[PDB]
Amino acid sequence: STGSATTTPIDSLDDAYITPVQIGTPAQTLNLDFDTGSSDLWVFSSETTASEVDGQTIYTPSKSTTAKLLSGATWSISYGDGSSSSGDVYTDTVSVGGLTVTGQAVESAKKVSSSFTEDSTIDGLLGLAFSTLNTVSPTQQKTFFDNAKASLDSPVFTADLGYHAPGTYNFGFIDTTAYTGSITYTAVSTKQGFWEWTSTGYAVGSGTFKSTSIDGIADTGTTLLYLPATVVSAYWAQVSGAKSSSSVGGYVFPCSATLPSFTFGVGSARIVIPGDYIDFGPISTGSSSCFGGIQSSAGIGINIFGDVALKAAFVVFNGATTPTLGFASK
């Protein structure tokens, strides 16, 4: 089997991407944030505290003939950005782009933090990291990909995120028309439950490539590119007037700037992030200070290849017995 679904930016900045997902019988379609940095599929629901719902589409398990309470199971998750959610669990039928999993754990939120409430466009998350990070207790549950894997034509999914445009998540096949040149594969460590890999270095603009190992995670659920302070300083030093602002919470730059590109290494291959991808616009409405898309990972504890980086590539998440990651230009 295979699946193919379009993923769409939630706003003009590509802050996140939503993908329609069919849950239950008859289908209830919710728009979920596919997140390769977590491993829970959770949704706004009929059980979500009413004051914490503001415009989201909810899953109502009582209206699904295939829903079953997973008795005694609870979940609770906290994300890197400080947001959180928790609740109980149903199993139900879940389909993505024509690919169907029966008995998928669908984690129903009883509580969500303010950032989720305030984002009316995201109806929940669909985790695509390794199932070892799944938070369901006392019986840990599998991700949608883990459940689908044995039925897939090939045990892979791909992320093809657009810059200010829709893109695609495919399951079970590699679309050879969706990228240019060849795909370069690189080793993955699953020790922390993430799609963790080591980039071979970077360049700023037309500058020389610096060969240096940068361990980090491929994370579709993180907006920005978070790298070591040395690398980030080297990038922003090439933008006149750019500075790190503790008051704003990272590097800002004059909105009048033309940003240089940023290249990262994948083995001997190179992925080029155009300068425009690194512009996240005014810090507040009408400001001439703009927020940077490359930020320091210092104090996160891990480097994160988020959407800013991933959307410059066609990315293969290879879930074979020994997982790997592939990157191609597009």
UniProtKB/Swiss-Prot annotation:
GO MF, any single term: aspartic-type endopeptidase activity
Active site positions: 35, 199
Reaction catalysed by this enzyme: Hydrolysis of proteins with specificity similar to that of pepsin A, prefers hydrophobic residues at P1 and P1', but does not cleave 14-Ala-|-Leu-15 in the B chain of insulin or Z-Glu-Tyr. Clots milk
GO BP terms: proteolysis
EC number: 3.4.23.22
EC category: hydrolase
S-S bonds: 255-290
All residue ranges annotated as the Peptidase A1 domain in the record: 17-328
Record keywords, A-Z: Aspartyl protease, Disulfide bond, Hydrolase, Protease, Signal, Zymogen
UniProt family annotation: Belongs to the peptidase A1 family.
The protein, known as: Endothiapepsin
